[PDB]
Amino acid sequence: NLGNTSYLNSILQVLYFCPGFKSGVKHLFNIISRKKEALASYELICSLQSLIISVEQLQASQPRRLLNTLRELNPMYELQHDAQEVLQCILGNIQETCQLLKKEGFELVEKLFQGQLVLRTRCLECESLTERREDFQDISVPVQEDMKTLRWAISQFASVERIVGEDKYFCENCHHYTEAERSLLFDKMPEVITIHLKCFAASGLSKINTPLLTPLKLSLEEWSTKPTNDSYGLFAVVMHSGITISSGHYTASVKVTEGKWLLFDDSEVKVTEEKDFLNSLSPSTSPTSTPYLLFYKKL
Amino acid sequence: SMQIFVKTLTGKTITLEVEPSDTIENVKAKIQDKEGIPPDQQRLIFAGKQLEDGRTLSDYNIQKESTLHLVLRLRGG
Ligand SMILES: COc1ncnc(C2CC2)c1-c1ncc2cnn(Cc3ccc(-c4nc(C(F)(F)F)cn4C(C)C)cc3)c2n1
Ligand SMILES: [Zn+2]
């Protein structure tokens, strides 16, 4: 009966095994509850902490209540939903609580998920450069061009792209419609990197079934403004099981951090060795559970 | 009035001519005209925040050259 909300379950598991998340929730719970001794956003922190406690006591030797908090903060969440969309709600309302509580560890979401992007545009006539700074919580990459590695997917996201034809860039220096090259580069790197694989497609909406060659260690340096010396590593993969984008069943796989992968199918847990799990992620295996969200933690 | 970029499902970037007072419904309608995706299937993410229907671009401080990310919903349960 638990797996009826596998969009909220699977996200709750990555967050539970997210480096420094539970400590962040309990720090904000103390401040929240002490002020209560001395509103629906307050409920989310209280509801989350109770769920964190519930998993703890069982593991030592609730997903429904979290959903009622969401039904007030969000009208739709009262059906099958998108796992990544729920991630925004939990990670967004926590920061909203923080922004209120800080005014009254307060950087729970900003220091853990948010990052900085530099969006540079180069007109091809005057060769001038314009820059933009935008925050990002996840890197939404494509899966198919219209075997390919995650390096290719991020390159399609961040490497120099040339907008031409019907999508011409309006240059204010030239005062005319012009060809431009766009290159988004990461400036500030959070401790948790989420990569949202756009496994959906359009023609007629379908789900792309072939995954990319997901690597265990990823270096986001080639698309960084600075010569970085830091790499990233997989610690969680949320997968979607199905053949259509309108229905399915989400699963999660979080690395033990001892050194294995727990597989979270509804209410079951099945430990998998490092080599077998990586094998099951290869495109040649034809994985029935297409990877949807990939999470990397700083080493 | 101002031009904003949208990164489609394949990573290809398209451009939209929008007003600061334009609502998210209007922006999603323009994206359909270029991409052929119904507005109810579209999710627009700007600066990590999802654009909610009924709000305006001035509410989210979307200025010229601002980049929106277009994603769909992958429902599961
Ligand atoms: C982390 O699970 C979750 N987190 C956040 N939300 C949720 C759901 C929203 C409620 C869960 C969640 N979902 C499904 C189930 C099913 N059973 N359980 C409890 C549980 C889970 C993992 C384990 C476990 N941990 C380890 C080790 F890593 F420590 F080594 C080994 N084992 C095994 C090998 C004994 C022990 C107990 C679940 N919990
Ligand atoms: Zn120019």
Author numbering:
A (entry chain D): 85 to 122, 140 to 162, 177 to 193, 196 to 221, 422 to 463, 482 to 538, 548 to 601, 744 to 785
B (entry chain C): 0 to 76
Sentences from the paper on this structure:
Ubiquitin-specific protease 1 (USP1) deubiquitinates substrates that are involved in DNA repair. Monoubiquitination of PCNA recruits polymerases that can bypass sites of DNA damage, while monoubiquitination of FANCI-FANCD2 appears to lock the complex onto chromatin. Deubiquitination by USP1 is presumed to reverse these processes to ensure genomic integrity during DNA repair. Ubiquitin-specific protease 1 (USP1) is one such target, with small-molecule inhibitors already in clinical trials. We find that KSQ-4279 binds to the same cryptic site of USP1 as ML323 but disrupts the protein structure in subtly different ways.
